[PDB]
Structures are given as C-alpha cells and as structure tokens.
Amino acid sequence: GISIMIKKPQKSKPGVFSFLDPLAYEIWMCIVFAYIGVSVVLFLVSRFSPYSESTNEFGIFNSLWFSLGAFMQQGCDISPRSLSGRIVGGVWWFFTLIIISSYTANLAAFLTVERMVSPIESAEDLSKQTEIAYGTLDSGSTKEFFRRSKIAVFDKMWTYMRSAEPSVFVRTTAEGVARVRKSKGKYAYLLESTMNEYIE
C-alpha cells in the first residue's frame, strides 16, 4: 500500500527553570527593587522621632523581615503602628494581590492552549490543511494515479500537486527523504508503505 511519511515532532524537553516562563525576565527583576524600597521606607518612617526612637521595634532588619513575609501572604508577627506605615502596608498588599493572580492565570492559559493541539491524524486532511506541503516521486505510478483517479479529495490533491511550486515532485527517494529531513515539520512525502516500513 501507498503511505504518507513525516518527520518526528521534536520532543519537548523541559528547561531547568521553565516555571519562570509565564512572567518574562524584566518583571522578575523589577520586583526586587520594589521589595527593597518598601523595606527601606518602612525603616525610615518607623524610627523618625514620634514628637524617643526607642518607642518601637521597627528597626531596619525587622523592616526587611516584615516585607518578605507580607509579600508571601504568610502574615507577620508585628504590625506598623503609625498611619503612615499602614499606608505602606496596604499598598504592598494590593501589589502582591495583583501579581500572584496574574501569574496563575497566565500559566493556566499556557497549558490550556497545548491540550487542544490536535496534531495531524490520518493525514487525509492534507486535502484540507494547506500550511504543510507534501511531495511525490516523479514518473512513479502515483503521478499517474492522482491524474487518473478522480475522487473529489484526490481531485483537490491533484489540483494541489498540479499547482504547487517549487514543485511537489522529486527525482529520487534519497533526496525526497533528504527534503523531509531538512524541511522538518513543514514538508511531507508520498511513498510505497513497504519502503517506509524499511526506512523508518
């Protein structure tokens, strides 16, 4: 029997940190500076005199410790006393609230698009797909058969085989296989199944 032949789809080896892929490099960078700034401002405002700086625990290091856990939504052991500090807290809270949600949504979308990939199957829809090209041997019986058979799907195949250029035709099995091997993904070939069964 005659057969269609295609390149293997390349296997999707993960990247070592692919979990970052939703969020782009610059965003991951710029979060860091904001974390610093928030911590520094919390420190400065906490220890400016209440009218005396001994009146609160919000030293620099404690101010760095508050912000990290606040960013994780892990809660905290202590809370800023002044209204000015509470402003900062609320702001940082809203900021994290947006980011975490956006990250989750994007990752879900990224997986979702994959599932419904629906790869070429039975390949009879090469009568219907047109982004992917397919070849046939010169002078081989197939070159008559698609002119000489007239079933509608094969009619439109032969119309494609007639019209497509640089042509679908090839002089040899060797260079047709080479064309598939180099023209990975985008190209396909028609051959006798007994030959495919030998080659593959």
Partner: protein, 53 residues
Amino acid sequence: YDKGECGAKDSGSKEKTSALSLSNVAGVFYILVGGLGLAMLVALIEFCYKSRA
C-alpha cells in the same frame, strides 16, 4: 527484520497522560536545598563571634 533497529514507544505507562513531570518543576527543589544549605554557615559565624567574647 534484523534491519529494523528502533522501537521505544509509550508502553506499560505513557508520558502523554496529563500530569506534570517532576522535571517540570525540579529547579525549585534545588533552590530550596541551597537555601537551607546557607543557613548553617550563619549560625557557625555566630558561634565564631561569640566563642571568644
């Protein structure tokens, strides 16, 4: 039949099912372990300070 020389195919169990592989999140575990690895040295320098007060 001697000339056929490839045959690895999803059998016994299959990759395609759905679940995330361990590899898909692996790096985070390296980050975790390295994090814990760091905190030992902080205590060691705290000793090296206090041990000659």
